[PDB]
Each structure stands twice: as C-alpha cells, then as structure tokens.
Amino acid sequence: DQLTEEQIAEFKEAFSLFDKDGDGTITTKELGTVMRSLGQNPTEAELQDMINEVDADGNGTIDFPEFLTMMARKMKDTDSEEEIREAFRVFDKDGNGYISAAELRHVMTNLGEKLTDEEVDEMIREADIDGDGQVNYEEFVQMMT
C-alpha cells in the first residue's frame, strides 16, 4: 500500500506552501505544522520520534521524499470529536459541559506537552467566556475538528 497520485498531489501542495525557496525542503521546526495542515493531529513526542528516525537537525530541514515516506506510515486516522470531548470532560467538574477558562489556561500551559500562553490565548479568544468565567467547551470540540 502507498500514496495515490491524488494524495501525492495533495501532499506536495501542502508541503510546498511551507517551502520558502521552492528548493524542495521544509524546516524541521515546521514538520508538524505541515502534517497538521493535512488533517493529522500528532503529539510533540511523535514528531520528535519521526525527526530522529531520519536523523534530521532540529535547526535543519526535511525533504519531500522523506516527508512523503513519513506521511505514508505515520499518517493516522483514529481521531474523532468524541476523544477531544472526553479529554475536556476530564476537567469538567460539574459535568454540565463547561470548564473554567482560567483552569484550562493553567493546565494547558503546565501539564503535558504544554502550550505557550499565546497559543492558549488564541484558543480561548475564539470562545465565549461567561459570567462565572466558564466556557462551553463543545465550542472547542467543534472548531478543532
């Protein structure tokens, strides 16, 4: 099994958007952003593993052939709005489908593969916070999928 002509064309198009010179490479730092533009949602650890697999330099680059090879294997399709919703629920104290905007911010920037404040501010910014400083997280579930 392998990538079809259509997929190859789709991937080249996506990869090319991040190829500043048309030289056939994307910086290693942007590998994740590119897979993400194709619909994937890889963890930071998975990316680092992929990068290490092809002995790339963190301040270095990756090429189309290896990129294609990575996508052929590493590309998955197990996500769903259910898992992102259950992830938020883990922090839903009352179970009524809301969470504290400030607790979300604090957890997201300290636990796990922490986000920067800017990234979280970007996320919260697109949701409506109500009087008790809470957010209807189904808003995130919707926009994240």
Partner: protein
Amino acid sequence: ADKLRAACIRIQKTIRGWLLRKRYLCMQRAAITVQRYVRGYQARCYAKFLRRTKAATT
C-alpha cells in the same frame, strides 16, 4: 502505635496514593489530547492563511 494500626496505615497510604496518581495520569493524557488538537487546528488556520495569500502572490 500498634500492629492493627500500622497495618491499616500502610494500606491507607497506598490507596490514597494510587487514587491521586490515577487521577494525575488521567489529567496528563487529557492535556496532551487537548494540546494536539489545539496545535492541529491553529496550524490548519495558518495554512489557510498561507493558501489565501499565495493566490495573491504575483
């Protein structure tokens, strides 16, 4: 300060720990799950931005 007491205390500390650990690991997985989707959607927005300005690129 006695056998029944000590035995019970050894059990209680193990349970108390296990409960909190379990909750922690769980919050950790949830955080990572939310974090990958956040990174995923912001990246898609950014790529959309690039697609939009490439067309304008002459």
